[PDB]
Ligand binder design. Sequence first.
Ligand SMILES: *[C@@H]1O[C@H](CO)[C@@H](O[C@@H]2O[C@H](CO)[C@@H](O)[C@H](O)[C@H]2NC(C)=O)[C@H](O)[C@H]1NC(C)=O
Ligand SMILES: *[C@@H]1O[C@H](CO)[C@@H](O[C@@H]2O[C@H](CO)[C@@H](O)[C@H](O)[C@H]2NC(C)=O)[C@H](O)[C@H]1NC(C)=O
Ligand SMILES: *[C@@H]1O[C@H](CO)[C@@H](O[C@@H]2O[C@H](CO)[C@@H](O)[C@H](O)[C@H]2NC(C)=O)[C@H](O)[C@H]1NC(C)=O
Ligand SMILES: *[C@@H]1O[C@H](CO)[C@@H](O)[C@H](O)[C@H]1NC(C)=O
Ligand SMILES: *[C@@H]1O[C@H](CO)[C@@H](O)[C@H](O)[C@H]1NC(C)=O
Ligand SMILES: *[C@@H]1O[C@H](CO)[C@@H](O)[C@H](O)[C@H]1NC(C)=O
Ligand SMILES: *[C@@H]1O[C@H](CO)[C@@H](O)[C@H](O)[C@H]1NC(C)=O
Ligand SMILES: *[C@@H]1O[C@H](CO)[C@@H](O)[C@H](O)[C@H]1NC(C)=O
Ligand SMILES: *[C@@H]1O[C@H](CO)[C@@H](O)[C@H](O)[C@H]1NC(C)=O
Lengths: 319, 319, 319, 171, 171, 171
Amino acid sequence: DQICIGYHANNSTEQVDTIMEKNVTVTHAQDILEKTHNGKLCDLNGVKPLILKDCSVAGWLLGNPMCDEFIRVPEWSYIVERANPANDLCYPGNLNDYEELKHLLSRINHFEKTQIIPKSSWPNHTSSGVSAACPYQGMPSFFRNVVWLTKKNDAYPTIRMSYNNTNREDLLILWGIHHSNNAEEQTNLYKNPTTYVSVGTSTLNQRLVPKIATRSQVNGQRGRMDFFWTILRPNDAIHFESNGNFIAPEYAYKIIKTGDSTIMKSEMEYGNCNTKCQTPIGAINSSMPFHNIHPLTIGECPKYVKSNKLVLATGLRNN
Amino acid sequence: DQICIGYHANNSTEQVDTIMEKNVTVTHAQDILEKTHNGKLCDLNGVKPLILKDCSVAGWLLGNPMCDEFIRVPEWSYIVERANPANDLCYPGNLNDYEELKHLLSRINHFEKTQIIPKSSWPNHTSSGVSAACPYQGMPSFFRNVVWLTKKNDAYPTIRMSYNNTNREDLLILWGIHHSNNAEEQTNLYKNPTTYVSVGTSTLNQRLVPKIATRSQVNGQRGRMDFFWTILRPNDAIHFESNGNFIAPEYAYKIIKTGDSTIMKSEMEYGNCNTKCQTPIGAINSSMPFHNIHPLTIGECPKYVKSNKLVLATGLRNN
Amino acid sequence: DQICIGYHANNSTEQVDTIMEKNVTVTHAQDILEKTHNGKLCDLNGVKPLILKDCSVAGWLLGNPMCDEFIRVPEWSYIVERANPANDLCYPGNLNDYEELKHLLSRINHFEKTQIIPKSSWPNHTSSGVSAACPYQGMPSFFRNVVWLTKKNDAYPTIRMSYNNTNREDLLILWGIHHSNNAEEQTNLYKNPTTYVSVGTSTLNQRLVPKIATRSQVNGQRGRMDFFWTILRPNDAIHFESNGNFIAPEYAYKIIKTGDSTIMKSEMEYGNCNTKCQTPIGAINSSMPFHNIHPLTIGECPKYVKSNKLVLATGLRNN
Amino acid sequence: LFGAIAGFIEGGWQGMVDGWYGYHHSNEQGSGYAADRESTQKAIDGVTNKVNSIIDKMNTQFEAVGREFNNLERRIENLNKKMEDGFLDVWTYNAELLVLMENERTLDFHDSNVKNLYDKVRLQLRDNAKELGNGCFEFYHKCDNECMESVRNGTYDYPQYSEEARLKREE
Amino acid sequence: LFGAIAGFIEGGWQGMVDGWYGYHHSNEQGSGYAADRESTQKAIDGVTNKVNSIIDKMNTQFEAVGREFNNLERRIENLNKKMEDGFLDVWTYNAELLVLMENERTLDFHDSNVKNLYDKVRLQLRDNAKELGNGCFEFYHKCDNECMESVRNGTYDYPQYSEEARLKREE
Amino acid sequence: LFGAIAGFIEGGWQGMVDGWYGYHHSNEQGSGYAADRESTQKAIDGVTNKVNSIIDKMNTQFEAVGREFNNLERRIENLNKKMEDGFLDVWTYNAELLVLMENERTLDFHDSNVKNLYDKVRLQLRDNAKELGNGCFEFYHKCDNECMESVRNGTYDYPQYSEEARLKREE
Ligand SMILES: *[C@@H]1O[C@H](CO)[C@@H](O[C@@H]2O[C@H](CO)[C@@H](O)[C@H](O)[C@H]2NC(C)=O)[C@H](O)[C@H]1NC(C)=O
Ligand SMILES: *[C@@H]1O[C@H](CO)[C@@H](O[C@@H]2O[C@H](CO)[C@@H](O)[C@H](O)[C@H]2NC(C)=O)[C@H](O)[C@H]1NC(C)=O
Ligand SMILES: *[C@@H]1O[C@H](CO)[C@@H](O[C@@H]2O[C@H](CO)[C@@H](O)[C@H](O)[C@H]2NC(C)=O)[C@H](O)[C@H]1NC(C)=O
Ligand SMILES: *[C@@H]1O[C@H](CO)[C@@H](O)[C@H](O)[C@H]1NC(C)=O
Ligand SMILES: *[C@@H]1O[C@H](CO)[C@@H](O)[C@H](O)[C@H]1NC(C)=O
Ligand SMILES: *[C@@H]1O[C@H](CO)[C@@H](O)[C@H](O)[C@H]1NC(C)=O
Ligand SMILES: *[C@@H]1O[C@H](CO)[C@@H](O)[C@H](O)[C@H]1NC(C)=O
Ligand SMILES: *[C@@H]1O[C@H](CO)[C@@H](O)[C@H](O)[C@H]1NC(C)=O
Ligand SMILES: *[C@@H]1O[C@H](CO)[C@@H](O)[C@H](O)[C@H]1NC(C)=O
């Protein structure tokens, strides 16, 4: 005539670990580590990313003629740049403070480009400059947002001109200077032999001067172009003054939406999917509190850990 | 006839938390989180802070006319700067390497200002330069520690002069250059049209040149002034040489005590209190080991945590 | 008639600590903190470090004449530099981007120096330049890897010359410019009064210009030399062009092994020992999992902690 | 360890599906299993609260932001990567270690609950039954299914059965 | 958990003001409360030592310094913030988590001390008394206030009262 | 705390060299010590497993790289130093604290193992012996050396001696 005290046991194979004992079968575990992704780049709450396949950020912003898909990009959630894009600064040189620009660009969700200085605005200069370093459909071309001013009637009269930001929004403005190869090229393209480019705003006080010297050949060019950018704030104005080697703005970007984003370096392609959690190597549909997929997350996401397995015991030791 | 084993219970409502159960009434708790401040800025072991009210560090250091209260500041414990002070570089421009200078200042407790180059020292130049950008009592004025040298008898003979640091301590020396607006202003103020400022010590080898170009109007001025600073070490000398646009030192700062401090950004006012622990939003009179008040502490202080509550159970579960 | 249950006790004095009780004698402890070093600098898996006793990295790489011990260095495991070496830039000046160069150096294990531009290569210039700032055997001398070009037959014809990296490896190339003291020295050493040094590769586009001004005396010299460096990639070329004040390369360094190393600041001397774990203050022969010796370890090493004591209890409380 | 689970109770019961802990009875009207609802509910309450505690407590963690540096910024590039790697190594130590420690404490929690149930029945029965030391109590009287249900829901009247148990201890 | 506090001892005593654990006696000369000086001092020692341990171990923590960066230094400004915020998130995880864990262990410490006291007198009394299983021992003989004081200060002579209890268990 | 080690067993045995826990017997053919190897091997297994766990868990830690900054880079020099110092303060908190906590739990592990051995013998013998409450069982019959070895290796036949023990509890 008997009564006993006992506890649950079942078929469960769920193992958990402890400091004293590893590989301990229990009756009721709970996994808290998400370890699977869909290997694709998706929307982010139904907002498609800007994927610059084969065009770098510099090539996009300056308007590489091979980057024509990005003439009028719509609002994005994040930006996807490849590891070594082909179309980036066709004419060799530098986009100065590039990394700071990418960091600025990661807090911007929508540009609307606008024509601040039309080519129509250079009556006394030639604005048809074109380079073999920038092919478009087999013929030489040039950056689309920026104008190569050269001499006209064998004169380069000094430019003194300003643009006043009448728009509500901040303006991202890019301009540049061209480093010629020797005195004779310098005189062929602009009449004046010693030149300068002066740029002034309320904060900016730049003087650029061509470095006329012999360099290595890059994209078939020993000449170089150094590009610079600034954020012209609303009601402020920018003052350009040059007598040669000036590469003038034509198009600038209105910063119209300024939320949350990142520039994600993935070699992957669009997946036509949607997600609440994107990583460089794929997205995540999960309500686990952790994942081990990739550290450079964006969106409402679990917390990245390096573990291969995380299971919490909820039940008893089972056999 | 009976004897029983039992434990304490009392009126206490003190709750503590655990991983398994929250809100567990116990007989004896102990709070270890300080959550109270006095909302005012105090002395620090009886040493009053330097509170630049409407003057920024640059303004104070260069000697902006509105910041005339800090002509000869006494030893401080910490420095309080506002978020957007009004009196800062009346004549527009830049204090170069400003952030590094503020970081150097956060480890200095006492300056003694000293006249290294009196206005008496410019027999062949005009030293009465003055600007509407720097009003003082309704009339145009200029930085007090730094001298705007201009032409005299329609000449700006080239300056060649040096100062040898005879003092026993380091000297903080500020000087500057002035960017004029066009060739004719450049000739009006200095006769020579193309000028330079050369500064040399044992470590420094600077050449500054005016960038004469049109900029935006700031404080009613399109001209600009770029200021620079260095730490002249004892027995070293500084060598200035200019033929225009030089804005010379008159006063320098002897760094006489070099202890521990910070530059605290607070909009608050002096409290006539004393404390051993100051934060931007108020001071702390507490022997708790933690607080949640503000992370940017100074003085003998608890350790900042973000928690809202921290109580250690010391007694038993109570009912 | 009796039987009892009991537990081990012994002579052990091993104490361990807990949150509740400190200094608790136990029967079986285990120390896991290594607290001993041999106070010497050793090989690292039988590879001797590079110890630049008294010569700095700049002095070594440029070839200070007091650094002749390091003309042709063998492969190293790590580099040991003293806190304040005496032989470093005998002619005063700067090695620009020095810190980035040292950071590049701590990931290089073997240089092979090579003569890219022999002194034989300057038919129209004087290449025997020499300074009292750089004594060697009581007579004035100069950096061994770098050539002070001066005028010849009272002419400094403008230099136009290039070097093409034919070697398999990256090349570390150093060159420099010389800042003279006044117009008269400038004409004495080079005939041309206003000069420049232009450097171009596929990435580099440098124009240097002498700052002719009065400076403080350093190593008996008011003149200065600013040195620069670059990594010439294989099959790329470097293009120098000067008409004065150029300090040309003669020797460059082939980067031939590119593993893992560090630059360790130790005042210590070689110990003829070997180790698998080196620290600034001595090496480590230990299979403990922790040490408290020094944080700036190199090699397969325990993990640095600040603790004075770490003992794990393995047995029972003993009396 | 409280020596009950896998201790003096040398195994679990495949047959008790209603809960984590409980009773198995056998009298002359047959046998059966019955989960102890209150000590099972307390344990599932405390364990889901512990799981929610761990998840809520690692809510504010570290997110690695992507930053980029050029060829002459390698020092702070290296600083940035060692910083992000350090914070993630730290937080994965924290996660793995907390999981290990509270797994140990959860297993021992279950153990304690089982021993406390065995004891709460022991205290009711005293010498009315015989502790077999295997987790069972061999009664000394006639415990029909109402009597068993009393033992379970805690309402076991010790006086009522004293005398007859009193005799078969003697005899 | 050791099943004593809020377990087989179903409640604390408002009446025991002198200490954390102790005894309540009732004989024919009346009744009273007496704390156990020893076990109570042992616990207050270990718990103030644990509190001092927790405070002293968070002596070397992280101190946030104010640094400032300009408009073209936003990368390292962001680096700086992520670093300081990371270290503060880390140390507040550490603080809150340590407090939670050692709160659980402090409550269970008290529990263990209580069970060990109950046991320590159970071992003295054996069959001289009857464990009611509510935390009390119903004696089988006459325990005046000095017999009680013996039970308290541990000096309870089991032989002396065997005989008399021997009968009142029988009968 | 499980109240066994330094509790109701007020001291260890210098004489038991073979193991951590075990038995000391005394019958009329003499006396001796015998380690209980099964519960000793279980404990040495679990404790070397815990030590290896603690070492393996701090495999991926933080290594400080040497970086250098010039006179106008003092901001990021200070940032670098606060970052490396922060990570080392963090990891030494982690190490010291983990050692303290699992030292506490290792001592209590040993305690629990001892109490579980005492209980495992108690359950075998019941009223065939008398618990002195000092860790010893004073038998009620004559346990020669084979009786003792049975008690040790767990094979103690309770029926065989009941009658005889039944009598001196009797008398
Ligand atoms: C940029 O253009 C705007 C367009 O008018 C100017 O805005 C005016 O500024 C004056 C100041 O002289 C104000 O009194 C007016 O209220 C503004 N006009 C309007 C319609 O809002 C602005 O001054 C220009 N800035 C520069 C630097 O050229
Ligand atoms: C600054 O002046 C001091 C003296 O006032 C100079 O120091 C002297 O240097 C001379 C050699 O030139 C020696 O007699 C001593 O070493 C110094 N004398 C004293 C009394 O200290 C110093 O050289 C000057 N510095 C410069 C850059 O000119
Ligand atoms: C440096 O010299 C080498 C000479 O070998 C040049 O490399 C040759 O490049 C041509 C293209 O012009 C190719 O046909 C070959 O692949 C290369 N030759 C060999 C033997 O490999 C290189 O272009 C020169 N670089 C510069 C900047 O002048
Ligand atoms: C634990 O179990 C996993 C499951 O396959 C196995 O791969 C691993 O080797 C086991 N390790 C130990 C120490 O038991
Ligand atoms: C430049 O354009 C202006 C206005 O269209 C005109 O007056 C002038 O003739 C042109 N040529 C020069 C060299 O100024
Ligand atoms: C715990 O107590 C606080 C006290 O106000 C209450 O706000 C909170 O909701 C309680 N939490 C839970 C989970 O019961
Ligand atoms: C100023 O000029 C006069 C006349 O040229 C000269 O005698 C005097 O020395 C000069 N003063 C300075 C400071 O050089
Ligand atoms: C622990 O023992 C060491 C041994 O020297 C002693 O220095 C220390 O003060 C002791 N601390 C405590 C709290 O007993
Ligand atoms: C020196 O210059 C002359 C004229 O340009 C040139 O012919 C000669 O080759 C150069 N050096 C020599 C002697 O090779």
